[PDB]
Write a protein that binds this ligand. Structure first.
Ligand SMILES: Nc1ncnc2c1ncn2[C@@H]1O[C@H](COP(=O)(O)NP(=O)(O)OP(=O)(O)O)[C@@H](O)[C@H]1O
Ligand SMILES: Nc1ncnc2c1ncn2[C@@H]1O[C@H](COP(=O)(O)NP(=O)(O)OP(=O)(O)O)[C@@H](O)[C@H]1O
Ligand SMILES: [Mg+2]
Ligand SMILES: [Mg+2]
Lengths: 120, 120
């Protein structure tokens, strides 16, 4: 199973910081993204996932083991901070997790989609 | 002086890797971005810059010292790899470096713009 996780509307708070000349707020959000994907990457490892990347505001991973996915996403939901949520997609391969990720980014965000469910 | 540096068309090679189920190529480009912004952040420190963020595929920094900017950008240009260039903007504040950055992303990419020059 592949899972892609990625920050919602992250650009808006970064751009807001440039335009208001707020470098400290810009630096805080950059390291906060850095640290939250770190939290996400570690929760995933503890549940038998192999991280593919944990960089920028995203994390992609895969698990040849079994996994409670309402648990996993309920904890991704819980690293939200200051109006920045995370969306997730899941599929049987990287491409499918990607599409399902677009689906979430495309349907309210702060949500998870599963590729097999979209097709049906 | 503020400088914002950011990777061109980085999403296209990442997305290409999802859609072709090429996780190894996806992981390589993620760490390669990680490592190139590292190279950029270090060259800037050696020339008297203070890094504001070095994350994702970008680096923003400022220098209360003086700086040869054709040198600096000529070396940013030289960390290009596999058809991924970097654009830069410069200004007297964060907002201005941002606009000048959009200008470069907006005018061929693999290029630098200076905010004061745009206004004139
Ligand atoms: N850790 C980070 N440090 C600095 N900039 C980041 C970081 N993570 C993401 N970004 C920036 O945030 C943006 C991520 O690109 P996205 O295209 O993913 N857009 P975003 O608004 O963040 O949300 P979605 O549309 O995906 O829901 C780019 O501008 C990245 O350079
Ligand atoms: N180090 C990284 N690791 C993983 N994904 C990254 C990294 N740096 C950037 N990205 C992704 O690349 C994109 C950066 O957002 P951008 O909105 O900056 N778009 P890009 O096509 O990269 O070029 P420009 O339009 O800015 O010229 C987002 O999808 C990021 O999540
Ligand atoms: Mg995002
Ligand atoms: Mg970019």
């Amino acid at each position: 199973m592949y899972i892609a996780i990625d920050g919602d509307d992250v650009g808006r708070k970064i751009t807001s910081s440039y335009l208001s000349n707020s470098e400290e707020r810009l630096t805080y959000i950059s390291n906060k993204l850095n640290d939250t994907t770190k939290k996400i990457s570690k929760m995933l490892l503890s549940n038998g996932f192999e991280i593919i990347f944990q960089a920028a505001d995203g994390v992609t991973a895969k698990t040849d083991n079994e996994v409670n996915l309402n648990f996993v996403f309920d904890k991704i939901k819980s690293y939200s901070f200051d109006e920045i949520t995370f969306s997730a997609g899941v599929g049987a391969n990287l491409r499918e997790a990607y599409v399902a990720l677009l689906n979430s980014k495309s349907n309210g965000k702060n949500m998870i989609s599963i590729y097999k469910d979209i097709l049906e």
